[PDB]
Design a protein around this ligand. Structure first.
Ligand code: GTP
Length: 461
């Protein structure tokens, strides 16, 4: 990805976008009961913690577009992946405005908490207005579409969340490139059924894990994988994507019946952005907050791994590449070992920066013992080994519980963490409950006991 030009939004007729300058994150009732070194991310240029320019930092993720055309390898990658997706009989039809708005099987209703985007964020109009669950009315939306059309600018916000001390000092704050409600609705009508097919089929056929339920999916993963596992992390995956990767994605879409709307992909690739008082244009880069960002990122990842394998190992049998991606995160396997380090070298030629899995210093062998997917490890249940526990490290849970945004969501926030925590074992879980109950707020929460979670889990398969 690369910014082509950035200039004052007033110069081109665009209103300044107001974005809070104060984090909504504050120490929680458990701030001193657990250990943690993370803090809220910088939201403005004036933050005293900054040790470098904020603007240069937030936009440095756009490292450039390393490649131009779609080469032979990418093309074969496209053919093979499109091939697998073909076996799903994905309904190529357009999704009706109603289902796209309020949901249907395989697709959840639009989230009312996320920004409505332009021009609404300038008008003031919000989502709770335009639509409402009960009536499942399209009228207002259906009207607003004709009123403002599509291909509307993306409102860029700094993501209010926790970041390491380094990310704070280097101004490495993540951005939320918000999609207009209109576009979000259009794209969901355009690809609605595709999204549903993926959500309903997480695995090695879609090579996607989007919409999955870790408590149940983790037991299926090991079986779907080939003998030898391999993985690696990406640095700035989204922002690093070059236009050619979007064209490759369009080729896949065309081959499975969505050629009549690949135009949408062009806006993800060549996009118009609004941030604060400035406006900018980006060539390449997957925007973080559009409808389908995850799924399209996962699809592109399926193309990238295939490509690197074809360019590094002529003769490789893709039919035996078993991989599952979630955006840039991925768990892959092959019957034979492969040099991740070498693959990373090839990745650099495609504009991708790949490094050892889980911040390792060097590329080492990936095992069922050290492999993670979505930050969770895989651990067979001590009593019934065929059931696999997705294990989120307690450190992550500790970092999170130490802060709050809304005291009203303390119950849900803590309950949610408990659903992640218990997989670490009964002992660890009770120590976690004990610390939570060591202060008034915790003692008042309705928290599930271990036995209850475990038995429920056992019965869920
Ligand atoms: N900008 C942005 N990225 C998001 C969001 N949600 C998930 N991501 C993903 O998070 C990535 C950014 O991660 P960072 O922590 O900044 O760093 P990194 O890319 O993992 O690279 P490292 O510095 O090596 O850890 C993007 O490339 C996306 O894949 C979001 O709301 N905004």
């Amino acid at each position: 990805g690369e910014i082509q030009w950035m200039r004052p939004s007033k110069e081109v007729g665009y209103p300044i976008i107001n974005a809070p300058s104060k984090t909504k994150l504050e120490p929680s009732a458990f701030h001193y009961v657990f250990e943690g070194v993370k803090e809220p991310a910088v939201l403005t240029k004036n933050d005293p913690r900054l040790k470098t320019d904020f603007e240069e930092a937030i936009f440095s993720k756009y490292v450039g577009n390393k490649i131009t055309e779609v080469d032979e390898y990418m093309k074969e990658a496209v053919d093979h992946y499109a091939g697998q997706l073909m076996s799903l009989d994905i309904n190529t039809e357009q999704m009706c405005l109603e289902d796209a708005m309020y949901g249907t099987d395989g697709l959840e209703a639009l989230d009312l908490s996320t920004s409505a985007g332009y021009p609404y964020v300038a008008m003031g109009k919000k989502k709770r207005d335009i639509l409402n669950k009960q009536t499942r009315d399209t009228k207002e939306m259906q009207k607003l579409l004709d009123t403002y059309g599509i291909n509307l600018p993306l409102v860029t916000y700094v993501k209010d969340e926790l970041r390491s001390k380094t990310k704070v000092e280097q101004g490495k704050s993540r951005l939320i490139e918000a999609s207009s409600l209109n576009d979000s609705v259009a794209m969901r009508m355009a690809f609605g059924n595709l999204y549903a097919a993926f959500h309903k089929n997480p695995g090695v056929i879609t090579g996607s894990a989007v919409g999955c339920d870790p408590d149940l999916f983790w037991s299926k993963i090991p079986v779907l994988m080939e003998e030898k596992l391999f993985a690696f992390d990406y640095t700035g995956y989204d922002a690093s994507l070059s236009p050619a990767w979007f064209e490759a994605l369009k080729m896949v879409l065309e081959k499975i019946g969505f050629g009549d709307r690949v135009d949408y992909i062009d806006y993800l690739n060549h996009s118009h952005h609004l941030y604060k008082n400035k406006t900018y244009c980006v060539k390449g880069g997957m925007p973080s907050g559009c409808s389908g960002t995850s799924i399209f990122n996962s699809m592109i990842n399926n193309l990238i791994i295939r490509t690197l394998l074809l360019k590094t190992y002529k003769g490789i049998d893709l039919d035996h590449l078993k991989m599952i991606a979630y955006g840039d995160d991925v768990i892959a396997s092959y019957p034979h070992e492969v040099d991740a380090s070498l693959l990373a070298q090839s990745g650099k030629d495609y504009g991708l920066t790949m490094t050892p899995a889980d911040k390792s210093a060097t590329f080492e062998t990936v095992t069922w013992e050290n492999v993670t997917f979505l930050k969770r490890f895989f651990r067979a249940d001590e009593k019934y080994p065929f059931l696999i526990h997705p294990v989120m490290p307690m450190k992550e849970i500790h970092e999170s519980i130490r802060w709050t945004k809304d005291p009203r969501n303390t119950q849900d926030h803590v309950r949610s963490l408990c659903l992640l925590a218990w997989h670490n074992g009964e002992e660890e879980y009770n120590k976690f409950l004990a610390k939570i109950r060591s202060v008034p707020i915790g003692r008042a929460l309705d928290l599930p006991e271990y036995s209850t979670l475990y038995d429920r889990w056992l019965d869920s398969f």
